[model samples]
Target: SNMLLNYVPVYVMLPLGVVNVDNVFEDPDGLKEQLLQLRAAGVDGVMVDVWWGIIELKGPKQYDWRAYRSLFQLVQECGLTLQAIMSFHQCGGNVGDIVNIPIPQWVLDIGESNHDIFYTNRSGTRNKEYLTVGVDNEPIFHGRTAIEIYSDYMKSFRENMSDFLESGLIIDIEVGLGPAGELRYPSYPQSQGWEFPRIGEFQCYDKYLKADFKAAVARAGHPEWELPDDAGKYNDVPESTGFFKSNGTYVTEKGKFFLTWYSNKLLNHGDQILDEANKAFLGCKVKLAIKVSGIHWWYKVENHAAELTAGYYNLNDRDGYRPIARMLSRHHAILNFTCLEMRDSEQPSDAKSGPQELVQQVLSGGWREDIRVAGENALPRYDATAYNQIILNAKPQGVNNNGPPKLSMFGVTYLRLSDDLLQKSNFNIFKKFVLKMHADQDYCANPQKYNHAITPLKPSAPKIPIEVLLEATKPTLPFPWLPETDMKVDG
Candidate 1:
């Protein structure tokens, strides 16, 4: 636990692909160059995907630990910590034709009906990886529910990977949730997006979600209160809909119950996943983590994307954090990502009106003090100064902001090692400051000096002069309504 105690956060690490395990384990001296380089870069750990698809690729019964064991042992040998990213979703389809990684072929061959087990969007297009599970207590596919199949494989993973955990080299395991390991539904805005004002809300039409929603309604004394299931589509669910108030709990007794219940379901399912992982790890200490969506769309100026109100609502975080925080504290330390494209300009031009406003807004305008936060972004598609911005405003606003030269606790990189991102001038410059902050006591004490390099600190918009408001309004408006007073008129 020394790693946890006196830990105000740690160094930067890369996303898995940097040294691809296959290259190292299969090719032997494969990642020696990359791994050593990572260590040299002051990277204390690496966030790697412990791919379920690759591990059990051949079939459900057989689990492959050869590559994983070797790769992890290799990292240990290199003296760097490892954070496994347990991604249960497919990568390529949404990006391009990278090849769809499917549920085990046996699971695929189990039944001829709904072979896809995919999530059906409101428009009826299938997101191949979204599985249908225990709806109303009945199985959704393959003669077993999605959760059943999930339980089966994860259990297998647990039984198989005991040695890795016992080794104690692995520092943490990021619990993957819905789409791309984030704890939410179809994270991307695709064909299944939403209708009109309901854009980002994902559907919950499957067996389990419906059952859960109804059960939640029952808590409010109206078990018969349906969730617009008869509408043929999610948006058509009619107003007076008591599920979630657009105003954010903006809550009715019914809406409150729905939000609480819906969020509980999401949290409880995660609890189960983490519990199983703990059982797998046995006695070893491993931190559990999750990603809160920082997709660029969240900050969009227009309503191109809708809030994911299907099951998620604003104040829902109370429920989201309540259970998650307790469970993590009891079983595994929780790690939350701190960055998601920080270098980009956010909506409402006045966003930067206050210092560190973007980072504070990431956790809903300030750190909740209930969960641990950190990130270096994935590096593949994000900017260098993005994380740097977190370091800057983080100091003044109360979060760690790389505390060696700052104050407080909580904050660190999520893993910045994207293929070529870490080796650039920007990354080096950012690192120089970080090292100065952590190791060199007197580095740059004021972020204002480095403000130009960070995001939130760099926003600027010229104010419109009062003269412009009088184009034709000089005569159109009562003379008394103008600013800086007219020169031609006497008071």
Candidate 2:
């Protein structure tokens, strides 16, 4: 059987809300106009973060959709598709602040009750009053349970905004559930005990998990010995715990097995929570695609390397990539955003500098190959080029910086400018460059050569910057003569 493949040109979706910067196009008219302009300029879609915590802070079920509704409707009217990024927590919010706004009172109550508290090693023992997820002072939420509330919010979005769903307004739904628990330690802080139902439900050692362990040992024909009363003590063993140092195979084996089993159970629960939320949200809008952050599994595998590696071999030959792929395929979307620390560490400073081949390998390996290609910190620049559809995020890192121009000159059908870039007087120059490239097919096909030939707009003509041109031509430069550093000097 012959299969026909269709490829859509990559489009850019710029974020349009308050994140680190305060000047966002919050007004309905301003936002609508921006969408119309982007669509008219041949841009395919607009990406906006639907911050639940910020939008619904007063009460759960209480939503301030007046601005959001207008924003969504305007995008639809302008013939631009919308990609809503649901952020479970507001990064800027206070530790105790109820984020995931309009958090339902019940969910907040549950989270407060189930807060994950950690105790410092200096304390010698765990203390609920003094706990921290990290030294950075970042607080941990019961993220797994928080996801259940997010599901309800998504469901509410689909149900209440049925007209928008029917109109096919939303193109992609990206879920970025925040991380729970401390960074260095494998164990969850005691505060989290209040939020998770499992902690409350299985407080005793006589639970089924303990019972099953004894049964498995007996079934293996091992000596019929009573399990220790302290079997539950192993439940919260810190990574620093010396149990793994034991020379005895039985001690090490049991320690490793329990840790692996417990970790998988938590991961499975997280997946289930996300899956259910996706299902609930998708049920109302059948056509809307879903994409989730791949960072969760990346962290899981990194944190539990040994057990996860062994578990990978045992599970149906679809270990590391299976769960995420299954979820993405089931939802008819992609896995795009990733917060894997390794990726950050590996990326070069010159944003656009990287080997293209490595990028192609990652893209073909079933990851969301295009979403993060244009950011200040991106890996293997070719990842952006391989995908037919791409979204480039343009944030300002330096003064007079015009965001990545190679993307535009390469025939990217969509271009979403960051708020700062949009506010710049030279935005129209960048916009015209993209429009001209889209209109000229040959120019796009030979972007590198053609981009070099294209002259920079005159300085008097309100140009973005000379750097944008230099970036498109000589993307990688060796020294000062290459205009790699900002030349402007203050008097």
Candidate 3:
């Protein structure tokens, strides 16, 4: 049987990417060497953030793609495919955030006076990582709404990167949906004294959000309904909060209304922005991707507190990732998930953490929606365990399955390009992983043999009825759900 095999490509997110915090291509020589080494190491491609701060630093509608133009060309010459991240969010203050590339300062200058432009928590402390969903439709940026600003940025990207798109050098464009470049609220910001395993605070106290919530309450015919007043602070545990506790407001009718409204607002924001992105890159030889954070802590609990605070209305009784998956399906964008390297046994049991279960659920959601799914490690790890876990998720069907192989994920991106990852010993481990990623179980074939053109982008508008998607709350992947266990990890 002369059947072809399926091999998932592995991408590496570049260290500091192409630019520095100062928005300059500061180390072309060093980066070129790294790129060569990565290509030599059997890696398929590289992912880099096209910082909004750097591109549109001067002012509104004034984009300077000078640095990115140079960077993309270099990657092209190096014979590496690219995944350009349209990073609309700030860089620092999140997990694994090493550099600080803020939302364009000109936009920040607007935020200085109109503080409601950013997400605010209960204590009125603003999160400046990304613009608040409340201001998505508002013309707060000198007559430009946040949506329009984002659309223009992407349009400009399309215009500037047309050559790369045409030549297939830039194969994917991962649009930044929110903070940490994932589709979620800035609930657990390090700048806000948030730490892991803590139930994060809801970021909906800004005046704009308040006004919208008030109107939504009125529309729901319960004008008296209000935003959560007892959701607790950023560092509180789920059991310590009224809203996300076992018998909490989250399961109540009123709680459902508020959470639905809050999470719906986020969905609408994503829908609008992705519609624009689809239009901007329509007909281009490129695929689109949007990342969703894997907030695994408190996932086993009924309320799923951390997820709710992060704008996922998913509960024990309801399906959250379905709507999100459906939304991405509409835009024909791949769902990029994080935390592929995490294991349930590697987390604090007190938090009821379940990264393995969460990964299954998320991947199942995407699979059920019939869309391409990609993955990335939440943190940098050069160990065999992490790489093995990533491979497990990326190709759940196994490398040497009975029939031609099937990929569980469209691709897997290693956390970053760095000195640690480049160390001789670590690099050797990575080389073996890359070989496996190419489905070279016996390690006989040259990786470059599988370095074929990526699957082409075709015009698609897949529709699964909203009701049908809503009813699909169970896992659809061939993988079975693991029974709940009281697994714990020691510090």
Best by TM-score: 3
lDDT of 2 by residue, 79-137 (tens): 76666666543332224542223323444554355443322222223322212222112
How accurate locally, in lDDT, is each candidate?
0.46, 0.36, 0.81
What is the TM-score of candidate 3? 0.92
**lDDT, candidate 1, residue 110?**
45
lDDT of 3 by residue, 303-398 (tens): 788999999877766778878888878777889998998998998789799888788888888887788899999998998778778877876656
Name model 3 segments beyond 4 Å from true: 1-4, 93-97, 400-402, 441-478, 481-491
Q: What is the model-wide C-alpha lDDT for candidate 3? A: 0.81
Tell me the deviation in Å of residue 135 in model 1.
5.8
List ranges where model 1 is wrong by over 4 Å: 1-30, 95-100, 109-117, 132-163, 191-198, 215-224, 228-257, 295-307, 316-323, 340-344, 347-371, 376-384, 393-411, 414-416, 422-427, 433-491
Q: Model 1, range 1-491, lDDT digits (tens) per residue?
A: 11112223344554444323232244446466667765665555566666666665666556676677777777878767667767676544544543445545555554345533554444445555645432312464435555555566666655566676666556666767666676666634443434333334444555456666788778767987664322233333223232222442324455455544554555555655665555544545455566554433222322112233433333312222333434444343454644433454433343211113323443422233244555545333334344445444334332233422222224465444544655666456545544422432222222233321112111112322223311211111111111111111111
Sort the predicted structures by lDDT, highest score first. Answer: 3, 1, 2
Task: Estimate the TM-score of every prediction.
Answer: 0.68, 0.49, 0.92
Evaluate residue 237 in candidate 2 and report its C-alpha lDDT on the 0 to 100 scale.
Answer: 22
